[PDB]
Write a protein that binds this ligand. Sequence first.
Ligand SMILES: [C]C1=[C]C([C])=C2[C](C3=[C][C]=C(O[C]C4=[C]N([C][C]N5C(=O)C6=C([C]=[C]C(C(=O)[C]7C(=O)[C][C][C]=C7[O])=C6[C])N([C])C5=O)N=N4)[C]=[C]3)C3=C([C])[C]=C([C])N3[B](F)(F)N12
Ligand SMILES: [C]C1=[C]C([C])=C2[C](C3=[C][C]=C(O[C]C4=[C]N([C][C]N5C(=O)C6=C([C]=[C]C(C(=O)[C]7C(=O)[C][C][C]=C7[O])=C6[C])N([C])C5=O)N=N4)[C]=[C]3)C3=C([C])[C]=C([C])N3[B](F)(F)N12
Ligand SMILES: [Co+2]
Ligand SMILES: [Co+2]
Lengths: 381, 381
Amino acid sequence: KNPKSDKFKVKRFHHIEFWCGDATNVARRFSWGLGMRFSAKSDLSTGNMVHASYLLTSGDLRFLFTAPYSPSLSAGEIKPTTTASIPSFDHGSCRSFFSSHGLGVRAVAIEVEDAESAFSISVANGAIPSSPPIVLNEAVTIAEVKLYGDVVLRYVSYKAEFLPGFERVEDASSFPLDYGIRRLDHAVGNVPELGPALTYVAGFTGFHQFAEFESGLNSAVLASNDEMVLLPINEPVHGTKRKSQIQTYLEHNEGAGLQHLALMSEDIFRTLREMRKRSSIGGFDFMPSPPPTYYQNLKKRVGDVLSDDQIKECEELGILVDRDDQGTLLQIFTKPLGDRPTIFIEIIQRVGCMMYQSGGCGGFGKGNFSELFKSIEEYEK
Amino acid sequence: KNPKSDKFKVKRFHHIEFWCGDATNVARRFSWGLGMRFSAKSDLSTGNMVHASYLLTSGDLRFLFTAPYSPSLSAGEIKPTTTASIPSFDHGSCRSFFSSHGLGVRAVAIEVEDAESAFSISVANGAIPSSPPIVLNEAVTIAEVKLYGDVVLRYVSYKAEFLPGFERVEDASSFPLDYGIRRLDHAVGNVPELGPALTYVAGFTGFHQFAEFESGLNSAVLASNDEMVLLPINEPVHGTKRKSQIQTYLEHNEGAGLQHLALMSEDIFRTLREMRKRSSIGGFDFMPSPPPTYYQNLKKRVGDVLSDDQIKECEELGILVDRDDQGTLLQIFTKPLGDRPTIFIEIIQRVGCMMYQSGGCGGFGKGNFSELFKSIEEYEK
Ligand SMILES: [C]C1=[C]C([C])=C2[C](C3=[C][C]=C(O[C]C4=[C]N([C][C]N5C(=O)C6=C([C]=[C]C(C(=O)[C]7C(=O)[C][C][C]=C7[O])=C6[C])N([C])C5=O)N=N4)[C]=[C]3)C3=C([C])[C]=C([C])N3[B](F)(F)N12
Ligand SMILES: [C]C1=[C]C([C])=C2[C](C3=[C][C]=C(O[C]C4=[C]N([C][C]N5C(=O)C6=C([C]=[C]C(C(=O)[C]7C(=O)[C][C][C]=C7[O])=C6[C])N([C])C5=O)N=N4)[C]=[C]3)C3=C([C])[C]=C([C])N3[B](F)(F)N12
Ligand SMILES: [Co+2]
Ligand SMILES: [Co+2]
């Protein structure tokens, strides 16, 4: 049941911003590993004396990578005279974030009808302000409120090409990589306490709980009116013999933060073939594949949705499959994106729920916890 | 003239250590961009709760990438009980270095006969101590003294496989990339004042000035007994209409530091073909190529050393050529390795001076400054 209670008009996920120590090296690694093109830049070459920011795109997916320059380059500037293209940026905030958390997501950005109104309504409804609305070149309005930990929910609204002050990059420097990723499906946070996190975020957005159906976690999913902006949140479950990966996350991250980004592929088999080709030559590694037992049990579950060929393809790529009462979900998880066992990526493809495809079709793979335990003891039989 | 005045026995360059915010992403970028294999690791998976360190190798070239974990992971440890594999590592030092300089070289490591003696003799002769000698697993001794800025000269000595506590990496995770790079030829520092820098380093090493033959710099080269460890140092020249790139370096780096690493290739044409193939897909970019004028003038200079084919190959790859009275130097420069206009890489190949090849054969490309200015005004003719 969807009460459609959004307190302001939300459109879609707009971009994700990583705070880095060196934006160049992270962006180049991610571009090769995920098949994303260099699309826009804001840095010294565009007059930005404050931060280096590079945008990667694949389909509608936008990854922004930002790092601070020496504060000395901009020490004569004041906020009215800043050369930063993202005026919410702060040298001290960024260094504090990165020294505390390592490489991770600073901003989950969603497009809204009116960022100034979204900010005002959010703060009026309990949101903790992070950066007030600012109009960029009379063209774009950006505002930020706290989401969890040091992650912000960033509102972006356009009167009418990423942000003012960003330049499109030279097509020679812009190689058209594409492994099939097309958009951000959902963004997942880890918190110490799920209840208060849910109460806070649902409180200021009006996002509603999304319909679901011990593995170390409890979780719930907050969703916008059309359920296209999806924000799952996890908490740890303690004293389980096998230590909760949520707890491990919280310790290595120094607290709450973004756990993973799920990226929708238009063809998950092509995406995984292309990413796995590059795992050992600069790209991303994947979690260990489930045993052949798991795939020997997939016929009895989704044999009506995937052929015997497409299930064999799942086995060679290590893809997981789960199923709602409305659709089917193909998913796989990368190993952590950086030094710490914190942030990772999920690749997904959803099958079903056509009207366009409705949001969250197939769920989020909850059933794959117990099926993994089943396949583990069935493999040792 | 070589007085062979080394105050202790120096062997060869051993490794270069980068201090990073995220060692994983920098190492993966560098591996793909330069064709270096993942060789050894020291990180959480090997019991290191202090820093993540990944070693890349190509031939005898060793690049180490290190970043700190949360200090909270090791807060119960003391130096006698540390899990760091490089006991000179300090969380505060590393964060201070990276916040001050961005991505850059922390350690220039050379192998010596006896690291404890090299440290003692160096400090007795004016070297500023950075980390005292420590014996690792009764097997390797490591000690550090200040070189310039926050760069240290690291002494490594073996009684008898990188360092104790480092594990060889899984061959599956270890793809045998190789673009032909084989060793570190020299490592170049930028300082505000060349004289006092030279007096200091030559003072504690006994390194001698290496034989040479306004572009914004003055420079000199310090060399070990057999001139295989080579350490050029630059200072800016001020008031030149065109601002000194050394000065620009010092401003963006927040002072003195390592400017570039020159990596010897066994086949610079293959290396540049392979690196340029990857420039736009995660690798490294190269400085703008010299005009065809420069190459039209190369016949009259090195037409006795390179064929008309090999000179055409230089033109398509943008390779520069210079010549001593003893040998010939092929060289090219990358764009900066990270966000800041600070550190970059040079690829080189030396032709001549065979006895083995003697160090510094062909010089360091000083003549390529004036020849570049000549080719610029000759191209506009
Ligand atoms: C620590 C640990 C966890 C598990 C499962 C094991 C187990 C093992 C089994 C398979 C394996 O490789 C495959 C793999 C391992 N992961 C990593 C863990 N994970 C997930 O994070 C996961 C997930 C399903 C959905 C999602 C989401 O999207 C979420 C949510 O959940 C909340 C709601 C909203 C969202 O959006 C997420 C994050 N599912 C199935 C999962 O398994 N992902 N794929 C690696 C290890 C094991 C055996 C047999 C023996 C040992 C010693 N271990 B062992 F202790 F290492 N171990
Ligand atoms: C700032 C600036 C510098 C120069 C040369 C120019 C000029 C231009 C010409 C070519 C170009 O692309 C090619 C390129 C540009 N670099 C970057 C600068 N560099 C070097 O750092 C360089 C070097 C030779 C040897 C070495 C070493 O190893 C050293 C030492 O030196 C000290 C002793 C020991 C070592 O070991 C080093 C670092 N050589 C020839 C050099 O040129 N490297 N390759 C890019 C720009 C220009 C024109 C025609 C018009 C404009 C507006 N400009 B413009 F102002 F952008 N401009
Ligand atoms: Co998910
Ligand atoms: Co050089």
